[PDB]
Amino acid sequence: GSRAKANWLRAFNKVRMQLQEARGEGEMSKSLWFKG
Amino acid sequence: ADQLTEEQIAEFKEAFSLFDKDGDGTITTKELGTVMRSLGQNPTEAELQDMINEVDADGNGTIDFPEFLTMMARKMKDTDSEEEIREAFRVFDKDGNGYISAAELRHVMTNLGEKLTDEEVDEMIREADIDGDGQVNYEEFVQMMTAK
Numbered sequence: 001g002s003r004a005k006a007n008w009l010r011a012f013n014k015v016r017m018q019l020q021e022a023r024g025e026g027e028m029s030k031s032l033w034f035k036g
Numbered sequence: 037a038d039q040l041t042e043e044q045i046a047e048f049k050e051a052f053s054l055f056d057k058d059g060d061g062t063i064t065t066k067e068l069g070t071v072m073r074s075l076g077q078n079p080t081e082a083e084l085q086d087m088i089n090e091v092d093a094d095g096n097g098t099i100d101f102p103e104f105l106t107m108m109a110r111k112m113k114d115t116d117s118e119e120e121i122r123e124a125f126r127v128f129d130k131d132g133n134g135y136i137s138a139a140e141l142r143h144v145m146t147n148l149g150e151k152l153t154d155e156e157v158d159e160m161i162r163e164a165d166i167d168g169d170g171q172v173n174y175e176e177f178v179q180m181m182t183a184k
């Protein structure tokens with residue numbers, strides 16, 4: 001068995017490494033208001 | 037933990053009481069409509085709900101005191117995680133929500149090697165499924181990689 005252990009590990013871990021890719025990007029969600 | 041200065045927050049509280057007319061402890065785009073309109077800016081209702089739901093954490097379409105203050109503090113390094121786990125959920129299910137299903141998880145499996153079926157996903161969800169719903173919520177994911 002243990003099919004989920006290694007696969008699932010790489011799963012939540014697959015996005016964990018992917019989260020860094022989103023970091024360091026310009027975000028305009030703040031829009032106006034935040035400028036103050 | 038990277039807390040603002042009492043003077044910075046206190047000043048916002050006074051501006052909140054004067055700026056906020058709804059009488060609630062949160063900020064609503066309607067109030068933005070009236071202020072931006074007063075300064076010569078009258079955006080459409082669509083931009084109002086958009087600009088407001090994106091500036092507040094969670095995106096309920098309104099910016100609470102902590103949500104707006106946290107966004108202002110975001111400029112300075114707050115935590116290493118920086119809510120990066122949210123991005124993991126956003127990729128697990130393009131859908132635009134924070135819940136991972138057996139199929140979506142299989143999608144992340146696709147990112148690595150191993151090919152899985154409904155059995156392998158139900159098992160992987162069985163481990164994180166503390167709620168017993170056959171699906172993995174946000175706290176369950178962090179229970180796996182974070183295990184706090």
Ligand SMILES: [Ca+2]
Pocket residue numbers: 056057058059060062063064067
């Ligand atoms: Ca309000």
Ligand SMILES: [Ca+2]
Pocket residue numbers: 092093094095096097098099100103
């Ligand atoms: Ca909000």
Ligand SMILES: [Ca+2]
Pocket residue numbers: 128129131133134135136137140
């Ligand atoms: Ca989903």
Ligand SMILES: [Ca+2]
Pocket residue numbers: 164165166167168169170171172173176
């Ligand atoms: Ca669950």
